[PDB]
Write a protein that binds this ligand. Structure first.
Ligand SMILES: *[C@@H]1O[C@H](CO)[C@@H](O[C@@H]2O[C@H](CO)[C@@H](O[C@@H]3O[C@H](CO)[C@@H](O)[C@H](O)[C@@H]3O)[C@H](O)[C@H]2NC(C)=O)[C@H](O)[C@H]1NC(C)=O
Ligand SMILES: COc1cc(-c2oc3cc(O)cc(O)c3c(=O)c2O)ccc1O
Ligand SMILES: *[C@@H]1O[C@H](CO)[C@@H](O)[C@H](O)[C@H]1NC(C)=O
Ligand SMILES: *[C@@H]1O[C@H](CO)[C@@H](O)[C@H](O)[C@H]1NC(C)=O
Ligand SMILES: *[C@@H]1O[C@H](CO)[C@@H](O)[C@H](O)[C@H]1NC(C)=O
Ligand SMILES: *[C@@H]1O[C@H](CO)[C@@H](O)[C@H](O)[C@H]1NC(C)=O
Ligand SMILES: [Ca+2]
Ligand SMILES: [Zn+2]
Length: 768
């Protein structure tokens, strides 16, 4: 009859099945001579030998069978499983919801740009930004190889495409075995090797069969058994693409996912591995709803479209004739004619070096230089001629956030953790495998709060240049600076306020550097300039401060030379002219001190940096009105700001012998960006200075130092209400500023180094 011929089509066990004896055509045995031969449905002991299912159990507290001396780690990926699915539909997914309940669960996991599967899947297993491992999109063109990249093409298995070191190679190079049941890269001969066991991708393999195979790798003899295995399924990405994120169709793809995870967990409890295996359940990206009333056509911006265009949520544009006009293609011209042509364009045009530095999406020959930052739910296509959902957007968008759930003896129990970025997962996986990670872009130790016994303890970065000294001196014999200050009558007296005694310097350090001065992790000849209201590290290598830090409380033409800075290591007033695009802007705004003698502490050559006049518009307005409002909102702020030189857009500080771009007829380098880090405290009944380091709140900006405000299309507005909106898409991690400057912040905080590392990896986000 029917319920003893479904054994050939069903991967579960019903009650009338147990004790059935061998048929040839059974996918899964439900015999009693079953276990001994290692081939039973996960629910066998749950429904027949009346044991309690894993899902019904209570979550026991802090193991493994005999041959398992180290906990195996399973990496489970459900493509396109956006974080909101778990927030809205966990009710419908009892097994996934148990993981959330008793394992370690993050609010969401940030993907990398572009938020596509091969990009993020390889990123997860290498811990590298897409710009570095090379898989920068599912479809790419490399000019050096003159080769196309595609999932349905064959060049996808050419190892020249795949950089870095995936986790499975890391596992094998240090004595463990790894088996991947589908993972982007696992079929490629990266570094001349495969995983210890891998599976040719066949999308038609049923999810249940994949779960059975992973559970049959764990039944192998100890000498052959893999220590790390991945498991991959295409839902809810496949159905999410066709029917959209809010759909009944996705709700039952999501229940199919819950079925398969539960299958895995039931089979694990059968083997007494359920409190042994370390399980990470994540996704590569999210899902966003699209429409055809939400298409942007390049024909509405060009008359002739003689360029190739990777379309969708993350578009790029290159020449149609490659490889011969690849370097010639006028990339800036396409960006400029896509710049503020209509008042309500649902995208913005960028060259790769102008992309928000937080994305880390330049510095790869495959990253074509024309790029489009498309608004959510819209797509950018070339022509006029779509439904359901897609992905690829900016990874700040709520629809792009991925789930991250962990379970096992190596993780904490029933713990909720803050958001983190998937680039952090590679390190965390080698910790659970007791492996030394290959170099990557995670901040090793920042995910330690997830682990029950952290395997790696971070140690502070060694300072690479201690400060020199710039002592107090007389005013030079002539004043060749070209600086003039009508207002000053007793020059000797006001210059004395820059000559504080040693304890007066301490008191200011206690006020303006409450977390310790930043350590310099490059080479830099610099001194420390103490004033009562601000402290700077002035570098003779770049004729300006490396950083300027000051502290403000909730509410709050004269320029001369710094007698501590030698003339040759100085900026002078005459370096800047009124028929030049660059004007001296201030790091510490003089308007913040009370005027009279305290204001003169900020009106010196040691407190100015070269600024495009239209950037100083943005810069001054932020300090003018925006910064004092954030101060009342957050109850005071510790501010630290300075220049960034990244002319080759690698995300790292430029060494000084690399800087070519000076201002006309001088030796003053033009920064590519300026950073601003604002530290307050979550519990705002406290100030930036009396806060437990564990409740610190950080907000950091890296502003593109650009000659126009084309990005905001605000070169002819009679206001500055546009500035806050553009600054809010140029936030960054403190870590991002550290990389771009060669500085190391927050060293003197009185808390474990791993806890500070969470603060530096935090990313401020404003898209609500
Ligand atoms: C993300 O992590 C990776 C790995 O730690 C970083 O990649 C490393 O980047 C540096 C410079 O970008 C590379 O060194 C350079 O090698 C080139 C040869 O192509 C040479 O011309 C330079 O003088 C320099 O020595 C290094 O090879 C590279 N390592 C790997 C494994 O790719 C990357 O910089 C990190 N990204 C960020 C934003 O932190
Ligand atoms: C709708 O089609 C999909 C295809 C895939 C897909 O995944 C892969 C994973 C691999 O490790 C290797 C592959 O070749 C693929 C692949 O080709 C593929 O189409 C993924 C998600 C989908 O929604
Ligand atoms: C790669 O594919 C594009 C199609 O967009 C084509 O223009 C180009 O000539 C191809 N290059 C090679 C080397 O196949
Ligand atoms: C490539 O393999 C060699 C050993 O054959 C190893 O020493 C090296 O670290 C590997 N390189 C990468 C980038 O994984
Ligand atoms: C793909 O998998 C299905 C089920 O596992 C199998 O029947 C089919 O033959 C496979 N196809 C290929 C081309 O391997
Ligand atoms: C902030 O700290 C004070 C203790 O000084 C406490 O009374 C207050 O409840 C805290 N605010 C919180 C926990 O939100
Ligand atoms: Ca650099
Ligand atoms: Zn997809």
């Amino acid at each position: 009859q029917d319920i003893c011929v479904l054994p050939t089509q069903s991967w579960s066990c019903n009650k009338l099945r147990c004790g059935e004896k061998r048929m040839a055509n059974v996918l899964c045995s439900c015999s009693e001579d079953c276990l001994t031969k290692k081939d039973c449905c996960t629910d066998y002991k749950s429904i027949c030998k009346r044991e309690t299912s894993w899902l019904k159990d209570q979550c026991a507290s802090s193991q493994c069978p005999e041959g398992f001396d180290q906990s195996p780690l399973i990496l489970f990926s459900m493509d396109g499983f956006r974080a909101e699915y778990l927030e809205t539909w966990d009710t419908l997914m009892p097994n996934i919801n148990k993981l959330k309940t008793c394992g370690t669960h993050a609010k969401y996991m940030r993907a990398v740009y572009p938020t596509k599967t091969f990009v993020n899947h390889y990123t997860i297993v290498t811990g590298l930004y897409a710009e570095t491992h090379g898989i920068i999109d599912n479809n790419m063109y490399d000019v050096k190889l003159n080769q196309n990249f595609s999932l349905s093409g064959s060049n996808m298995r050419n190892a020249a495409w795949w950089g870095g070191q995936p986790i499975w190679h890391t596992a094998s190079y240090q004595g463990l075995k790894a088996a991947t049941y589908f993972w982007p890269g696992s079929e490629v001969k990266i570094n001349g090797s495969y995983p210890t066991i891998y599976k040719v991708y066949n999308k038609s393999t049923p999810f249940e069969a994949r779960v059975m195979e992973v559970l049959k790798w764990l039944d192998l003899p100890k000498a052959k058994r893999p220590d790390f295995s991945t498991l991959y399924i295409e839902e809810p990405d496949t159905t999410g693409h066709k029917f959209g994120p809010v759909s009944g169709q996705v709700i039952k793809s999501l229940q199919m996912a819950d079925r398969t995870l539960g299958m895995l967990m039931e089979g694990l409890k059968q083997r007494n591995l359920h409190n042994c295996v370390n399980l990470i359940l994540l996704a590569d990206h999210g899902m966003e709803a699209i429409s055809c009333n939400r298409l942007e056509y390049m024909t509405d911006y060009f008359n002739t479209v003689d360029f190739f265009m990777y379309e969708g949520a993350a578009p790029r544009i290159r020449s149609k004739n490659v490889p011969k006009d690849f370097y010639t293609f006028d990339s800036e011209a396409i960006v400029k004619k896509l710049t503020c042509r209509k008042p309500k364009q649902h995208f913005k045009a960028y060259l790769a070096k102008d992309l928000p530095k937080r994305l880390h999406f330049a510095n790869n020959i495959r990253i074509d230089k024309v790029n489009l930052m498309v608004d959510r739910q819209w797509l950018a296509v070339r022509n006029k001629k779509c439904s359901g959902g897609t992905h690829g957007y900016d990874n700040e968008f709520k629809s792009m956030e991925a789930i991250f759930l962990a379970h096992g003896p190596g993780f904490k129990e029933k713990t909720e953790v803050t958001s983190f970025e998937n680039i952090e997962v590679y390190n965390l996986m080698c910790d659970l495998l007791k492996l030394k990670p290959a170099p990557n872009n995670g901040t090793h130790g920042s995910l330690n709060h997830l682990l029950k016994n952290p395997f790696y303890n971070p140690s502070p970065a060694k300072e690479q240049s201690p400060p020199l000294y710039c002592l107090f001196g007389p005013v030079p014999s002539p004043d060749v600076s070209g600086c003039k200050c009508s207002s000053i009558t007793d020059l000797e007296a006001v210059n004395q306020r820059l000559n504080l005694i040693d304890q007066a310097k301490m008191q200011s350090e206690a006020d303006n550097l409450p977390y310790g001065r930043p350590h310099v992790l490059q080479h830099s000849k610099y001194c420390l300039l103490h004033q009562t209201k601000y402290i700077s590290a002035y570098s003779q290598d770049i004729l300006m401060p490396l950083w300027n830090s000051y502290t403000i409380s909730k509410s709050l033409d004269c320029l001369r030379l710094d007698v501590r800075i030698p003339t040759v290591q100085s900026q002078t007033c005459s370096n800047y002219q009124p028929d030049l695009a660059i004007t001296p802007g201030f790091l510490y705004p003089p308007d913040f001190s009370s005027s009279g003698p305290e204001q003169y502490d900020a009106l010196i050559t040691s407190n100015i940096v070269p600024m495009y006049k239209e950037f100083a518009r943005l810069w001054n307005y932020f300090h003018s009105t925006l910064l004092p409002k954030y101060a009342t909102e957050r109850n005071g702020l510790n501010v630290i700001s300075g220049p960034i030189f990244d002319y080759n857009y690698d995300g790292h500080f430029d060494p000084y012998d690399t800087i070519d771009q000076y201002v006309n007829n001088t030796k003053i380098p033009i920064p590519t960006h300026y950073f601003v880090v604002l530290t307050s405290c979550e519990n705002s009944t406290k100030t930036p200075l009396n806060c437990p380091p564990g409740s610190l709140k950080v907000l950091s900006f890296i502003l593109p130092h650009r000659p126009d405000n084309s990005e905001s299309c605000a070169d002819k507005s009679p206001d500055n209400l546009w500035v806050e909106e553009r600054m809010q898409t140029h936030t960054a991690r403190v870590r991002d500023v550290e990389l771009l400057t060669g500085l190391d912040f927050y060293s003197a905080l009185k808390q474990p180094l791993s806890e500070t590392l969470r603060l530096k990896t935090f990313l401020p986000i404003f898209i609500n």
